């Protein structure tokens, strides 16, 4: 009912801005994820993921992408996009919402079972 605002700003205005202000928008720990330098060491796969997510999908839920990584930072440029996360054994389908901005990725994993 109540439209959310990301930590002060809304979705469209947040999307129409770059990292140079996004970093001060969100917290400190994830700032170091891009403040040390350009991410290219093991982020070639991540850039491929960004390109795949920005690829134009049909007018429905976009395609799913399977990855062996769980070390992506959730940026607004991929919200509303389905991705398969290799939770140890299987590429589990995940569901995201625009409230995921500024957090990590691999926190949706259950260790063994509820017992």
């Amino acid at each position: 009912f109540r439209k959310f605002t990301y930590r002060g700003v809304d979705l469209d205005q947040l999307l129409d801005m770059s990292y140079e202000q996004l970093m001060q928008l969100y917290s400190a720990r994830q700032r170091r994820r891009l403040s040390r330098g350009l991410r290219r060491k093991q982020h070639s796969l991540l850039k491929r993921l960004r390109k795949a997510k920005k690829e134009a999908p049909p007018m429905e839920k976009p395609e799913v992408v399977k990855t062996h990584l769980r070390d992506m930072i959730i940026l607004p440029e991929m919200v509303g996009s389905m991705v398969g996360v290799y939770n140890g054994k299987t590429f589990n389908q995940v569901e995201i919402k625009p409230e995921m901005i500024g957090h990590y990725l691999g926190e949706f994993s259950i260790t063994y079972k509820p017992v």
């Binding site: 605002t5 930590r7 700003v9 917290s27 509820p114």
Partner: protein, 69 residues
Amino acid sequence: YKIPDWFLNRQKDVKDGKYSQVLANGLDNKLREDLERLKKIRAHRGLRHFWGLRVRGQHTKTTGRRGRT
């Protein structure tokens, strides 16, 4: 009144981002809102709060013997 912002309890909240010191019922309401947000997110911290275990990353094999029976 020239009081610096770092001294406040919760700063740059996920709802509005403004810097405000919060009172008892306000803190309880904000804690409820944060736990409900974590529940909706289905994050690891939220689910571990749901089962009611230690969420900071402690041990349970020898700690927590006064809880569930």
